[PDB]
Amino acid sequence: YYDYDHGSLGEPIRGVNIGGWLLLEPYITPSLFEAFRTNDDNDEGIPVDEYHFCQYLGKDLAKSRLQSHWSTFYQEQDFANIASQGFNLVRIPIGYWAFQILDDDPYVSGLQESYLDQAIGWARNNSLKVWVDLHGAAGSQNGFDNSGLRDSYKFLEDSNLAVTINVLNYILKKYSAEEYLDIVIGIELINEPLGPVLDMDKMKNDYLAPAYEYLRNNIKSDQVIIIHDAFQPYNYWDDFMTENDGYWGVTIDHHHYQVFASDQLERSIDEHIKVACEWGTGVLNESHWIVCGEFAAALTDCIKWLNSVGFGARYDGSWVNGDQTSSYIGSCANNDDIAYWSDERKENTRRYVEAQLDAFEMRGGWIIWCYKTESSLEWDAQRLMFNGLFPQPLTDRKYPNQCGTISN
Ligand SMILES: *[C@@H]1O[C@H](CO)[C@@H](O[C@@H]2O[C@H](CO)[C@@H](O[C@@H]3O[C@H](CO[C@H]4O[C@H](CO[C@@H]5O[C@H](CO)[C@@H](O)[C@H](O)[C@@H]5O[C@H]5O[C@H](CO)[C@@H](O)[C@H](O)[C@@H]5O)[C@@H](O)[C@H](O[C@H]5O[C@H](CO)[C@@H](O)[C@H](O)[C@@H]5O[C@@H]5O[C@H](CO)[C@@H](O)[C@H](O)[C@@H]5O)[C@@H]4O)[C@@H](O)[C@H](O[C@@H]4O[C@H](CO)[C@@H](O)[C@H](O)[C@@H]4O[C@@H]4O[C@H](CO)[C@@H](O)[C@H](O)[C@@H]4O)[C@@H]3O)[C@H](O)[C@H]2NC(C)=O)[C@H](O)[C@H]1NC(C)=O
Ligand SMILES: *[C@@H]1O[C@H](CO)[C@@H](O[C@@H]2O[C@H](CO)[C@@H](O[C@@H]3O[C@H](CO[C@@H]4O[C@H](CO)[C@@H](O)[C@H](O)[C@@H]4O)[C@@H](O)[C@H](O[C@@H]4O[C@H](CO)[C@@H](O)[C@H](O)[C@@H]4O)[C@@H]3O)[C@H](O)[C@H]2NC(C)=O)[C@H](O)[C@H]1NC(C)=O
Structure with a gap:
């Protein structure tokens, strides 16, 4: 047993996915x-x-x-x-x-x-x-x-x-x-x-x-x-396996990304952050323990084969499936090579990461998708940390309380 709303760890879940x-x-x-x-x-x-x-x-x-x-x-x-x-x-x-x-x-x-x-x-x-x-x-x-x-x-x-x-x-x-x-x-x-x-x-x-x-x-x-x-959507599982019916030890796992749809990829950094912060406030009202089992620092779907073998990326409008298409938003060139990351992109990713961590830690915690990959940066916790894009220590904040300061 583990009480996800009052865990014996004395802190929220802060995990990594042993993916692939x-x-x-x-x-x-x-x-x-x-x-x-x-x-x-x-x-x-x-x-x-x-x-x-x-x-x-x-x-x-x-x-x-x-x-x-x-x-x-x-x-x-x-x-x-x-x-x-x-x-x-x-x-x-x-x-x-x-x-x-x-x-x-x-x-x-x-x-x-x-x-x-x-x-x-x-x-x-x-x-x-x-x-x-x-x-x-x-x-x-x-x-x-x-x-x-x-x-x-x-x-x-x-x-x-x-x-x-x-x-x-x-x-x-x-x-x-x-x-x-x-x-x-x-x-x-x-x-x-x-x-x-x-x-x-x-x-x-x-x-x-x-x-x-x-x-x-x-x-x-x-x-x-x-x-x-x-x-x-949120609250959907509130009426399933309720405590009133004697059920206990049930945790809902919400996954959160903002890169698998063109409208999401089109968001400005401020919109991406507002959405992330709301992911956190929204579960506070849920009827079950909850943990964000997957999320990433990714703000594009540019990483090779992220959309599966044979498919491109919606971000640079190279993605097409059947009669469904995508449109150009930004370049995917050298996407996972830090040498080609502008200061703006670095800042935006660090901010995005911090907002997500703060949000998910409001209740239950988080588990980043992917501790390691062969060549990705956006989906690789190790590389994100090495390049200062993911907090070390985990409570380190270059942009504190972003979720407590949103309006514009
Ligand atoms: C960090 O986390 C890590 C993850 O958990 C953790 O890893 C573990 O580290 C320890 C420490 O090194 C490892 O234990 C040592 O393992 C050595 C190798 O043993 C393995 O091979 C045995 C034989 O090889 C084949 O086995 C298959 C299947 O049975 C057969 O089909 C083949 O024919 C082979 O067998 C033939 O060849 C043999 C050798 O010539 C021969 O003896 C045999 O007759 C055949 O002819 C295999 O038997 C063994 O599997 C189990 O075997 C029986 C049950 O079937 C039991 O002995 C155990 O259940 C044993 O389990 C393994 O080992 C430990 C249990 O001790 C277990 O935790 C593992 O998960 C694993 O399943 C292995 O597959 C061993 O040589 C060595 O033995 C030592 O012997 C010393 C002298 O007696 C003792 O003083 C030592 O204490 C130690 O253990 C003693 O002897 C028995 C071990 O066999 C113990 O049962 C007994 O209690 C006593 O303590 C170690 O056991 C372990 O393998 C490893 N596990 C994992 C997950 O990788 C690590 O420890 C953690 N570190 C920290 C910091 O905590
Ligand atoms: C604050 O928190 C409260 C709860 O304390 C929220 O209020 C409502 O809480 C309910 C908890 O039981 C939620 O119930 C769920 O409602 C779902 C329907 O919501 C949408 O419906 C539209 C139109 O049908 C769909 O398009 C959407 O996809 C959503 O589904 C149900 O699906 C869900 O499960 C149902 O179970 C029954 C019984 O088995 C089935 O018959 C049914 O088919 C379905 O599977 C469940 O019933 C409820 O959503 C929620 N209110 C809503 C609608 O948001 C407040 O909402 C929270 N405040 C806010 C808005 O933040």
Whole structure:
């Protein structure tokens, strides 16, 4: 158990996402996917997600490459660094296939759990809390490449849901045992299910509710469950698993970004800040504990493959999907190279980061998306800190109380 509104840490959650480790994401580790390029002029043959990364290589080759990646992308050293920087928690995404695969799944399985356990040990070793996050469901819960399978939305299909549920129960049972309660203070049932295109009622009654029942009445543990907001507006979950009905230990995970839509990318720095501050004040009125499980310093969607393999960026109007387009806003040239960042851009990012931190710390805390990437700056906590764009110590402020001074 962990009281997110009055945490034993004596401070709000200040974590980092161990992204792209146990679940591959092209923009985080582009070299793994660039390895498939045979023509420097086109993306033909390049897998768009881990599903196809495995399918293309075949079991044996996929296993050896993944093993090299899992054993090196993150090691205990990283967790020591994380702790040395003031963070108090790590969020670890893992796919359902790590534990169980569909008859026709190409995924490498049965090896990721060992690394997950090692990381939990490294976390305990360094006084870091942990969130075990089931980041991918059979058939995909959102069609994002970060679910493992892009452009598929069969999460709630009885056949798939049965597998995902069995895996979730395995996770709930194992990581809710007494020996993990002190370090693992949250198990996220499913990352970013795409609410708008899914049957919300089926997810609630056939996935979320049963999980709570299993954990509290079958396993009988006080472990806290994390429910992603499914992209629904604030207060949407207030009437779900309420305390009045005897439910407890339920935290809503809100993700916050301002780069995945043209109108958002068009905002001035002051508008970006006003929106960030409101993300914080808005949850104060919510009926459940809450933590911002993901946010970034990013103010553009310029980073290579951020919009998945084969797609450009809305920021410089190079993004197009089907009959949907984007329009020019600003340049994406040398986007992630600090040498090409103007003083204005540096200031704006630092301000944006501070406003977000202040806002999210109003209640529950935050977890920055991505401690490390191969070449990104906007999505890389390590690089942001090195370049003075992310606070060190975490309470350091060059632009204090921005959320307390807004009007114009
Ligand atoms: C920071 O956080 C880190 C993350 O948690 C944390 O990491 C941990 O560090 C410790 C310290 O170094 C590591 O422990 C040492 O591990 C050494 C290697 O052991 C591993 O290999 C064993 C054999 O290898 C194969 O195993 C597979 C599977 O069984 C077989 O199929 C193969 O055939 C191999 O076995 C053959 O070969 C063997 C060697 O020739 C032979 O003996 C065997 O008969 C076969 O022929 C493997 O057995 C072992 O796995 C477990 O084995 C049994 C249960 O199956 C138990 O012994 C343990 O459960 C053991 O678990 C592992 O080790 C510890 C438990 O001690 C556990 O925490 C780990 O998570 C891991 O699962 C491993 O896979 C060991 O050689 C070494 O043993 C020492 O022996 C000394 C002499 O007796 C003792 O004085 C030492 O105390 C120490 O441990 C003793 O002996 C047993 C260890 O086997 C203990 O059970 C016993 O209580 C006693 O203490 C260490 O155990 C650990 O691996 C590592 N874990 C992770 C997550 O990576 C780090 O410690 C943290 N640091 C800080 C600052 O806190
Ligand atoms: C201050 O805090 C109070 C709460 O103390 C807020 O007041 C209301 O609090 C309710 C808590 O139960 C909120 O209920 C939710 O309302 C959602 C609907 O809101 C929008 O509706 C439009 C039109 O339908 C949609 O387009 C939007 O996407 C939103 O959904 C519900 O979706 C949500 O869940 C529902 O559950 C029922 C029962 O299972 C289903 O039948 C239904 O289909 C749905 O799944 C839930 O009921 C309520 O939103 C909230 N008031 C609103 C509308 O903001 C104050 O709002 C807070 N003050 C502010 C504004 O900051």
